[PDB]
Amino acid sequence: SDKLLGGLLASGFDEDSCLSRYQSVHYRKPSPYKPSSYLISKLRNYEKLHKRCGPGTESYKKALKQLDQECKYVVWISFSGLGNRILSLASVFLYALLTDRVLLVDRGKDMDDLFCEPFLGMSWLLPLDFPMTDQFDGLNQESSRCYGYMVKNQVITLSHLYLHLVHDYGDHDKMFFCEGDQTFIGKVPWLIVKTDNYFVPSLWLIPGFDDELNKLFPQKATVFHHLGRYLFHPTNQVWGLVTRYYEAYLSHADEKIGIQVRVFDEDPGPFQHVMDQISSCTQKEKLLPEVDTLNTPKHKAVLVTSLNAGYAENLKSMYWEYPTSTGEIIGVHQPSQEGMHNGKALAEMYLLSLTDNLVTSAWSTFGYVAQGLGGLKPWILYRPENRTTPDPSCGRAMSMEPCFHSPPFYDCKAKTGIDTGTLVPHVRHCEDISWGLKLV
Numbered sequence: 454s455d456k457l458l459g460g461l462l463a464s465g466f467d468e469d470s471c472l473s474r475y476q477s478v479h480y481r482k483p484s485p486y487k488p489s490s491y492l493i494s495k496l497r498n499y500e501k502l503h504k505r506c507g508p509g510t511e512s513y514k515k516a517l518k519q520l521d522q523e524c525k526y527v528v529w530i531s532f533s534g535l536g537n538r539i540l541s542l543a544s545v546f547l548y549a550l551l552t553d554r555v556l557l558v559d560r561g562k563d564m565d566d567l568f569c570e571p572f573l574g575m576s577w578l579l580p581l582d583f584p585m586t587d588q589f590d591g592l593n594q595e596s597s598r599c600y601g602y603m604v605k606n607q608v609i610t611l612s613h614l615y616l617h618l619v620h621d622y623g624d625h626d627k628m629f630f631c632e633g634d635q636t637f638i639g640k641v642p643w644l645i646v647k648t649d650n651y652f653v654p655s656l657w658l659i660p661g662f663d664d665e666l667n668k669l670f671p672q673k674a675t676v677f678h679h680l681g682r683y684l685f686h687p688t689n690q691v692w693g694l695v696t697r698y699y700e701a702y703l704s705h706a707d708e709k710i711g712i713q714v715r716v717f718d719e720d721p722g723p724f725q726h727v728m729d730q731i732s733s734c735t736q737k738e739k740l741l742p743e744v745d746t747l748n749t750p751k752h753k754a755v756l757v758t759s760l761n762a763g764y765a766e767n768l769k770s771m772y773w774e775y776p777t778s779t780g781e782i783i784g785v786h787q788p789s790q791e792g793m794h795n796g797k798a799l800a801e802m803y804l805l806s807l808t809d810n811l812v813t814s815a816w817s818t819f820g821y822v823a824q825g826l827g828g829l830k831p832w833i834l835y836r837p838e839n840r841t842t843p844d845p846s847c848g849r850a851m852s853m854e855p856c857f858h859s860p861p862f863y864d865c866k867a868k869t870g871i872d873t874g875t876l877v878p879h880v881r882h883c884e885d886i887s888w889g890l891k892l893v
């Protein structure tokens with residue numbers, strides 16, 4: 454039932470310690486995407502595993518002694534910007550599900566300040582004494598237990614491997630995405646991953662993983678919408694930022710439009726070419742109305758997020774200064790202008806996720822997280838060139854999924870390059886960044 458997201462969440466968490474977990478319902482349209490029964494059982498079974506093998510259990514103490522050389526593990530290193538961390542952690546989780554491993558999370562500076570516990574009865578956090586923690590900063594493509602390094606140097610009983618899956622990775626790190634190397638990695642009890650990518654799409658190209666993924670996800674472009682909603686619930690101090698903003702500014706409207714504005718440029722602007730992009734997109738797509746210089750009205754709330762407030766200022770000044778062609782009543786709202794940090798950034802992604810129709814910015818993982826949690830197939834503001842308003846200014850995404858920006862392009866069987874975006878109908882080149890891949 455609705456608190457549990459059609460069965461995706463388990464009941465029995467203590468409510469006061471993570472209010473947001475089951476108070477989604479009061480702020481959110483129910484999602485039209487039903488998790489499959491298979492997936493539900495995958496998630497209930499994972500909780501069982503994570504309980505038996507989790508941090509602090511006897512089995513975890515037993516498995517830990519294998520670091521000097523019936524439970525296996527993958528560890529995520531807190532690394533990169535928040536949006537990356539969300540995506541990448543979700544990917545690692547899917548990985549864990551596909552390899553019968555326990556997920557442990559490096560809490561970094563902030564992870565448990567931002568997210569509640571997602572696994573009933575046992576913490577997902579990596580213990581603070583974990584032997585290898587001090588190495589995490591230093592782990593890279595040239596480390597001795599780097600899988601890519603070992604393959605390159607043709608080395609090959611491993612108790613642990615580092616898996617370098619950062620965007621800068623290479624031909625050898627990429628072999629992670631091949632069946633045969635998966636077969637070998639399969640036997641290693643401790644995996645340590647550093648990554649900044651939503652690498653989910655290339656898992657669908659790995660035989661055996663394909664069959665399971667088809668079953669878990671009959672609707673293939675719901676991977677981040679289900680797993681993201683399962684894993685990420687914001688803590689009480691983040692959720693207060695959401696509820697307070699939503700209550701004060703947002704909850705009167707017949708309709709909500711999200712506009713997620715990321716401008717990848719070392720000058721904060723604001724830029725007139727992007728202002729014009731945003732008013733062309735919202736108008737040409739009938740997301741917001743035109744204004745004039747000469748039923749009964751709906752109220753639309755425009756939620757703008759950006760580092761700079763100039764975009765929201767413009768929209769605000771336009772709908773203030775001029776009547777709408779439609780008679781519609783438009784209000785424009787932006788929460789911050791950042792130029793608690795991480796907490797505001799998360800809240801804003803969750804407030805985006807609450808909108809009825811979302812505009813995103815090309816290449817931005819902030820937009821990916823918001824679209825995904827909300828189950829929103831967005832309109833993507835294309836990445837400009839030469840400070841000119843792209844024409845067309847935006848277009849509808851193929852699907853609500855996040856883009857894998859740095860995928861491998863290798864046919865593991867033939868052992869030769871290949872464009873892995875043109876192999877199956879459900880894995881395609883991204884709308885924003887044509888190099889990448891996403892599920893459709």
Ligand SMILES: Nc1nc2c(ncn2[C@@H]2O[C@H](COP(=O)(O)OP(=O)(O)O)[C@@H](O)[C@H]2O)c(=O)[nH]1
Nearest residue numbers: 534535536537715758759760797798817818819
């Ligand atoms: N609060 C807030 N922070 C933002 C916004 N846009 C960018 N940021 C900050 O800059 C970071 C951008 O990195 P990331 O989250 O990985 O997303 P990306 O760089 O757009 O792909 C965000 O996490 C925020 O800390 C915004 O609209 N609101």
